[PDB]
Amino acid sequence: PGVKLTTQAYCKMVLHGAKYPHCAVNGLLVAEKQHHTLFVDCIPLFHGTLALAPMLEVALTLIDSWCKDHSYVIAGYYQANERVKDASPNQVAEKVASRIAEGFSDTALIMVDNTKFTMDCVAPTIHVYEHHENRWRCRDPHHDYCEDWPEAQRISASLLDSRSYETLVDFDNHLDDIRNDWTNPEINKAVLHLC
């Protein structure tokens, strides 16, 4: 089963990682339920301590309420480590992956690397882990998960060059300040306009 994702979600993930480069970041990809797995968009969950179930329950239940409003389904959950020389999945990541795999039959664990994380990204710089309820832990050697690569580079370079990524909002900022949303409307407008 191939894994395909739109440039919008990848830009969201990279941008959320850029927002907090000193702490670990967390995100949740969303697909469409109706063999290849297509990802629609991602939402950033939390940042910082990143070892708490209480707020995770709130966030995941809110996302579930969201997915039953516009007829969506939670695809998978992605996590980046704090240390640069760290590319191994933590226990919380596997627990969340199993929790999402109970419902959906296709949950990929996305790992953002840190060693190949610069302004001029080469290309893939994503680790796709394929986890289950059993002891199956395999990561794909190298495949193509993005649709158009040169256009993706142009938009990513424009987004990272121009300092317009301070507006990205997380679920924690929603609790701290109700006013900011969490769908990132301006980011969607920019991804549509740049194309």
Partner: protein, 52 residues
């Protein structure tokens, strides 16, 4: 200024034995029946500031 460390140690040892325990947290019912209007309070005044 611990002039006599041992004597101060003993004095604090007996002072900590004298003091009792009264959990001031056990009274949570006062907040139970109340009103929440201050969170409406600066929420009005938290709109007015934008993001730099």
């Amino acid at each position: 200024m611990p002039a006599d460390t041992n004597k101060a140690f003993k004095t604090e040892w007996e002072a900590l034995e004298l003091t009792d325990h009264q959990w001031a947290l056990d009274d949570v019912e006062e907040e139970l029946m109340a009103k929440d209007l201050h969170f409406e309070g600066m929420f009005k005044k938290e709109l007015q500031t934008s993001i730099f």
